[PDB]
């Protein structure tokens, strides 16, 4: 059920996404969330993200709850506030959301330890898409990546479930993408979601 890049629905081309504000473009009921990013101790700006509930409802809702603080463990909220980007690969993608361990080993979802892959509808056809990181089939948790180039080799192995909205969002993505990293692609200076929520 993977769509080719000529069967893509309206509202998700790069140009369309860059015209987006705070409301969804693919389907009117898709939630829009945000991250405020700090690079080191410096405010870098806001990434706004449409979550494709219409195509990947379980993936969208997992991410959404981690943005708003609605998901609790024994009455303790857990989510993306304070989470970092631990793996940054220029010209490829930026990876983050490991609030469990901060190093890429963490996996927790709102549904349990993991959740299965939803249908692979959208391809990794351009920069600015949100997709699930995993460790093989049916191992989605909390980590995600934002594409910094097309990466269609990932199709049918990672669910594309959102898109960044507006030009500032992509500017922030590009800023994160270009920070200095070590030989393991970990940033030398931390990149952190200092605030997040729903618009």
């Amino acid at each position: 059920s993977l769509l080719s890049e000529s069967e893509l629905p309206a509202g998700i081309s790069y140009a369309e996404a860059m015209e987006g504000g705070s409301r969804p473009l693919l389907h009117p009921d898709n939630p829009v969330v945000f991250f405020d990013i700090s690079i080191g101790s410096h405010e870098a700006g806001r990434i706004k993200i449409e979550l494709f509930k219409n195509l990947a409802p379980k993936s969208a809702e997992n991410f959404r709850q981690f943005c708003t603080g609605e998901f609790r463990q024994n009455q303790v909220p857990i989510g993306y506030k304070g989470a970092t980007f631990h793996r940054i690969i220029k010209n490829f993608m930026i990876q983050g959301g490991d609030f469990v361990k901060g190093d890429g080993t963490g996996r927790l979802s709102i549904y349990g330890s993991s959740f299965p892959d939803e249908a692979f509808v959208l391809p990794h056809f351009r920069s600015g898409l949100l997709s699930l990181a995993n460790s093989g089939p049916d191992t989605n948790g909390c980590q995600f990546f934002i594409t910094c180039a097309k990466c269609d080799w990932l199709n049918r192995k990672h669910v594309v479930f959102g898109q960044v909205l507006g030009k500032e969002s992509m500017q922030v993505v590009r800023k994160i993408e270009h920070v200095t990293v070590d030989g393991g692609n970990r940033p030398r200076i931390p990149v952190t979601v200092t605030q997040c929520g729903e618009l």
Partner: peptide
């Protein structure tokens, strides 16, 4: 390679 895993990063 250029994958996005969570635990064993492969080439």
């Amino acid at each position: 390679x250029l994958l996005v895993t969570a635990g064993l990063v492969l080439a």
